[PDB]
Each structure stands twice: as structure tokens, then as C-alpha cells.
Amino acid sequence: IVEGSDAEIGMSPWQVMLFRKSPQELLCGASLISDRWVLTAAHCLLYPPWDKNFTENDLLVRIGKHSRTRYERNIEKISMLEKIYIHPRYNWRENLDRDIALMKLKKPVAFSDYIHPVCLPDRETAASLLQAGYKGRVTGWGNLKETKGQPSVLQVVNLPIVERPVCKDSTRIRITDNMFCAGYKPDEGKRGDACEGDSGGPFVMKSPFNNRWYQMGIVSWGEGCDRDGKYGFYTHVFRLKKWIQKVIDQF
């Protein structure tokens, strides 16, 4: 996260770290949506142009974390994966359309002050909150700039949703209805972006109707980090919600 700030303790209790077993390192962000299901970006698990194709046994999920690097004894919970599910129409060949994946944990995780699931949006919440100018929040342990390097603790930044024409006009990439973009415009003064390592993490909004946090997006892609005239792109979670429910209902 670029131009973010240190998270408060328990500020994002759904935040998940996707962690490689060997070498032991951060791979991606992710989010907890129930006691046994974690949501992330497909490209965190599968991206053939970079020879990336992780299997269940390659990875761990670390939940309840604040510090990036330390083993937070008595606080974090580390879980093994039972099964990865990648959207069958995830477009890694072109534009990362439908950049979404679910991970089923081998055993359910115990909720705590530091571990709690985020809500997925219903049609009506999505319709009301996914509007240009409305701010959501992105969190992760990714890079602090495009080229300090890495954060000591979880970072947070609040970013406005950007109008579709402005998103489209910022890039040569083909934008789809399964994506939205967020970030400040060059004139707006304030800055901030996700960066490498934040991928797969949540873009959340707090509903003013019921005071609950909803995950509206997944950190998907960008060109650099926090560049003027560019915006971060997020997977549009509600648009892929039918696939999400199908996987959870079936498996």
C-alpha cells in the first residue's frame, strides 16, 4: 500500500495473508468470508505468463495478523488448504477478467478479537455503494512504493471509486463489467494505491444502512503504483457472486 497508514489492531479482522511454505514468504492478500472459506485473486494462484501455478500443498493461510514478518503467537491462526477453486472464465491471457478464486480450509478457524469474516454484498448494497466518488478501503502488506520498501505492519488506505470513462481512458487494457477502478485523480491532492503484494486483498466499504463491512472488490491489477493519471483495478465481487455461492453451495 502506497501512501497508507498503519492499521489499528483488529481494524481488518478478515484480512488474510497468503504465505508460501518454501521459501517462507508473503505471496498475496486475501479475505475471510466464513469459518472455512477464503477469497482472493485468481492471479495470486495461477498466472502462466510468469510460470505461476500454485497447488494446495504449496501454500498456507495466516489469519488474524498485524505484523508482516513476525509469527504472532497466541494471535494469528495458520491454516492449510483443502481445495483451491479458480473462476472457470478467469482470463489470464488478456486482461485478468474475472480475477477471483476461493480457498477452502482443511479445518474451520476459530473467530476472535482479531479474526472475523467480512460480508459479501447483496444486489441492493452493491447498487447503492458502488458509485463514483464513494470511498472504500484497501489493506495489505504489499510494497510501500513502486520501486521504505516493505511495511512492518498491515497498511490501510481509503480510496474513491472512479467513474468508468476515467478508468477506461487511463489505460490501454480492455476494461470489463467485472472490474472497477479506484484512486485519486491528479488534481485531487490526496494520493494512495495498492501495490505488489497487496493483490488478492479486499476493497471494503462500510454500509451506512446497517453499519456492516462489505467486500466490494478484490485487489486485481495496476500499471505501477500510485502514478498520477493511473488507477488500481479491482475485481467486482458482486458480479461474480453467483459463482461464489455455487462453489460454496456445492463443495
Binding site: 489499528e8 469474516p117 460480508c119 472504500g136 481509503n158
Partner: peptide
Amino acid sequence: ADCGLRPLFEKKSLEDKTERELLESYI
């Protein structure tokens, strides 16, 4: 059922330092 309500914030009626920024944007 209990999703989206944080033990250290909503469950205790405590606000985090910047959540109001989000609320203020929902015009």
C-alpha cells in the same frame, strides 16, 4: 450472520480513526 461487525470496533461501539471518511463520501 455476524459478518462485517468487528469485535474491537462495531461490537463495542468504537469507531476506527478514518471510517468517518468513508461515511462522509456516501452523499
